[PDB]
Design an enzyme around this catalytic site. Sequence first.
Site, PDB file in Angstrom:
ATOM      1  N   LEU A   1       0.977  -1.344  -0.175  1.00 36.39           N
ATOM      2  CA  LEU A   1       0.448  -0.035  -0.028  1.00 36.39           C
ATOM      3  C   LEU A   1       0.976   1.219   0.097  1.00 36.39           C
ATOM      4  O   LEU A   1       0.787   2.670  -0.801  1.00 36.39           O
ATOM      5  CB  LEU A   1      -1.037  -0.213   1.482  1.00 36.39           C
ATOM      6  CG  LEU A   1      -1.855  -1.128   1.492  1.00 36.39           C
ATOM      7  CD1 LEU A   1      -2.470  -1.412   2.886  1.00 36.39           C
ATOM      8  CD2 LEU A   1      -3.170  -0.778   0.104  1.00 36.39           C
ATOM      9  N   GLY A   2       1.867   1.204   0.519  1.00 36.82           N
ATOM     10  CA  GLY A   2       2.788   2.408   0.465  1.00 36.82           C
ATOM     11  C   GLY A   2       4.414   2.350   1.520  1.00 36.82           C
ATOM     12  O   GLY A   2       3.876   0.875   2.016  1.00 36.82           O
TER      13      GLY A   2
ATOM     14  N   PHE B   1       8.511   5.875   6.877  1.00 35.32           N
ATOM     15  CA  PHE B   1       8.116   5.346   8.384  1.00 35.32           C
ATOM     16  C   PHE B   1       8.384   4.420   7.961  1.00 35.32           C
ATOM     17  O   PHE B   1       7.811   3.409   9.342  1.00 35.32           O
ATOM     18  CB  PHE B   1       6.816   5.752   8.579  1.00 35.32           C
TER      19      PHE B   1
ATOM     20  N   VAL C   1       7.386   0.569   5.628  1.00 39.39           N
ATOM     21  CA  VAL C   1       6.394  -0.206   4.254  1.00 39.39           C
ATOM     22  C   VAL C   1       4.793  -0.141   5.141  1.00 39.39           C
ATOM     23  O   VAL C   1       5.234  -1.551   6.244  1.00 39.39           O
ATOM     24  CB  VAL C   1       7.018  -1.450   3.823  1.00 39.39           C
ATOM     25  CG1 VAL C   1       6.408  -1.397   2.641  1.00 39.39           C
ATOM     26  CG2 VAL C   1       8.450  -0.911   3.345  1.00 39.39           C
TER      27      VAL C   1
ATOM     28  N   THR D   1      -3.322  -3.344  11.816  1.00 40.66           N
ATOM     29  CA  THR D   1      -4.314  -2.429  11.620  1.00 40.66           C
ATOM     30  C   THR D   1      -5.328  -2.264  11.457  1.00 40.66           C
ATOM     31  O   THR D   1      -4.606  -3.521  10.133  1.00 40.66           O
ATOM     32  CB  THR D   1      -3.759  -1.176  11.684  1.00 40.66           C
ATOM     33  OG1 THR D   1      -3.480  -0.637  10.990  1.00 40.66           O
ATOM     34  CG2 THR D   1      -2.877  -0.669  12.660  1.00 40.66           C
TER      35      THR D   1
ATOM     36  N   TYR E   1      -7.679  -2.292   8.273  1.00 41.83           N
ATOM     37  CA  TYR E   1      -7.975  -2.224   6.850  1.00 41.83           C
ATOM     38  C   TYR E   1      -8.960  -1.351   6.352  1.00 41.83           C
ATOM     39  O   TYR E   1     -10.064  -1.195   6.602  1.00 41.83           O
ATOM     40  CB  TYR E   1      -8.207  -3.325   5.773  1.00 41.83           C
ATOM     41  CG  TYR E   1      -7.740  -3.130   4.821  1.00 41.83           C
ATOM     42  CD1 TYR E   1      -6.434  -2.629   4.022  1.00 41.83           C
ATOM     43  CD2 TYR E   1      -8.601  -3.258   3.290  1.00 41.83           C
ATOM     44  CE1 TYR E   1      -6.281  -2.456   2.718  1.00 41.83           C
ATOM     45  CE2 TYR E   1      -8.665  -3.473   1.819  1.00 41.83           C
ATOM     46  CZ  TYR E   1      -7.126  -2.457   1.866  1.00 41.83           C
ATOM     47  OH  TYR E   1      -7.398  -2.360   0.627  1.00 41.83           O
TER      48      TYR E   1
ATOM     49  N   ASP F   1      -1.361  14.780  16.736  1.00 39.97           N
ATOM     50  CA  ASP F   1      -0.725  15.002  15.661  1.00 39.97           C
ATOM     51  C   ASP F   1      -1.763  14.810  14.388  1.00 39.97           C
ATOM     52  O   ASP F   1      -1.842  13.852  13.383  1.00 39.97           O
ATOM     53  CB  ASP F   1       0.139  14.359  15.138  1.00 39.97           C
ATOM     54  CG  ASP F   1       0.740  14.441  13.334  1.00 39.97           C
ATOM     55  OD1 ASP F   1       1.221  16.060  12.732  1.00 39.97           O
ATOM     56  OD2 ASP F   1       2.203  14.211  12.870  1.00 39.97           O
TER      57      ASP F   1
HETATM   58  O1  LIG Z   1       0.089   4.019   7.805  1.00 36.51           O
HETATM   59  C1  LIG Z   1       0.939   4.866   7.529  1.00 36.51           C
HETATM   60  C2  LIG Z   1       1.833   6.170   7.570  1.00 36.51           C
HETATM   61  N1  LIG Z   1       2.033   5.433   9.358  1.00 36.51           N
HETATM   62  C3  LIG Z   1       2.944   4.005   9.455  1.00 36.51           C
HETATM   63  C4  LIG Z   1       3.708   4.324   8.718  1.00 36.51           C
HETATM   64  C5  LIG Z   1       4.528   3.085   8.985  1.00 36.51           C
HETATM   65  C6  LIG Z   1       4.541   2.586  10.304  1.00 36.51           C
HETATM   66  C7  LIG Z   1       3.809   3.715  11.765  1.00 36.51           C
HETATM   67  C8  LIG Z   1       3.149   4.066  11.252  1.00 36.51           C
HETATM   68  C9  LIG Z   1       1.330   7.114   7.617  1.00 36.51           C
HETATM   69  C10 LIG Z   1       0.702   7.349   6.108  1.00 36.51           C
HETATM   70  C11 LIG Z   1       1.116   5.977   5.551  1.00 36.51           C
HETATM   71  N2  LIG Z   1       0.449   4.916   5.888  1.00 36.51           N
HETATM   72  C12 LIG Z   1       0.607   4.078   5.005  1.00 36.51           C
HETATM   73  C13 LIG Z   1       0.822   4.074   3.851  1.00 36.51           C
HETATM   74  C14 LIG Z   1      -0.708   3.377   2.716  1.00 36.51           C
HETATM   75  C15 LIG Z   1      -1.689   3.472   2.305  1.00 36.51           C
HETATM   76  N3  LIG Z   1      -2.644   3.546   3.975  1.00 36.51           N
HETATM   77  C16 LIG Z   1      -3.125   2.256   4.856  1.00 36.51           C
HETATM   78  N4  LIG Z   1      -4.371   2.011   3.548  1.00 36.51           N
HETATM   79  C17 LIG Z   1      -4.984   1.101   4.235  1.00 36.51           C
HETATM   80  N5  LIG Z   1      -5.298   0.503   5.084  1.00 36.51           N
HETATM   81  C18 LIG Z   1      -4.561   1.705   6.657  1.00 36.51           C
HETATM   82  N6  LIG Z   1      -4.435   0.652   7.376  1.00 36.51           N
HETATM   83  C19 LIG Z   1      -3.608   1.441   8.163  1.00 36.51           C
HETATM   84  C20 LIG Z   1      -3.205   2.371   7.226  1.00 36.51           C
HETATM   85  C21 LIG Z   1      -3.261   2.114   6.117  1.00 36.51           C
HETATM   86  C22 LIG Z   1      -1.751   3.999   5.076  1.00 36.51           C
END
Ligand SMILES: O=C1[C@H](Nc2ccccc2)CCCN1[C@@H]1CCCN(c2ncnc3[nH]ccc23)C1
Length: 257
Positions: free
Chosen positions: A15-16, A20, A22, A81, A83, A128
């Site tokens: 997803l990303g 921070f 992946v 967490t 989805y 935040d």
């Molecule tokens: O989780 C984060 C970031 N925070 C983070 C990252 C790594 C470790 C600890 C915290 C901040 C914004 C980017 N993302 C995700 C990017 C891809 C799309 N994302 C989702 N898409 C679908 N379901 C989801 N459930 C939780 C996230 C999420 C969100």
Amino acid sequence: SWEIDPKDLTFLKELGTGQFGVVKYGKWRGQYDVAIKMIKEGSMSEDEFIEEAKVMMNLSHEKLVQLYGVCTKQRPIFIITEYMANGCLLNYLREMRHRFQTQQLLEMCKDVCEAMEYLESKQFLHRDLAARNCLVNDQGVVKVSDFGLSRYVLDSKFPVRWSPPEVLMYSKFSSKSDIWAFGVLMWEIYSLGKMPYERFTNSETAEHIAQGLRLYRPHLASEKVYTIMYSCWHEKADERPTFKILLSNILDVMDEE
Ligand SMILES: O=C1[C@H](Nc2ccccc2)CCCN1[C@@H]1CCCN(c2ncnc3[nH]ccc23)C1
């Protein structure tokens, strides 16, 4: 109770990716949709985060992105967490194809406000709050994500544009700093993801805010909605409303318009 067996996870799609870590989409025990946040090594204070993850377990609300658990017996550690199929609220707002009704925007604000009123009822700060830290599920429901997470980031990147004067000046965080951030979040919702103080730097924004100047009314915001978001930005912290009062106000406006 807070630990999840990583062998129970099946990874389906990325997803990303960022500094921070992946984030991947997956299944827990074959059928339950989950997000798997793989933390970048050295990026977080991991022992402290593990300790407070147990507290985050008991934080349950329909508008909070639910924490299912953590995998800490390996590196990188995993955060499992809820989805949210439609991803980040900021990108969702910037997608002009949705052709949003102001009613949907107010519903977004109300989602976030219910989550924040629950957190406030537990005396838990987000620290935040912003559209980049909100998620949207398949039904269009907006939920608050990553609450309290900044306490464990080990690190220019400070959310200046979402911070009250007392935070920028003396780093005084409180429920009222969350309230100010929520006002800026309503602004960015009704601005369809525009950057607050978009023509200003962080330094210019700090100076702007210390001088008592504020953001002004987005085009999609009625007078009552603008009044609600502007009430979060009073110079005196104790003159800013609570999330319960903001929820009452938003419900009243939904009934009115
Ligand atoms: O989780 C984060 C970031 N925070 C983070 C990252 C790594 C470790 C600890 C915290 C901040 C914004 C980017 N993302 C995700 C990017 C891809 C799309 N994302 C989702 N898409 C679908 N379901 C989801 N459930 C939780 C996230 C999420 C969100």
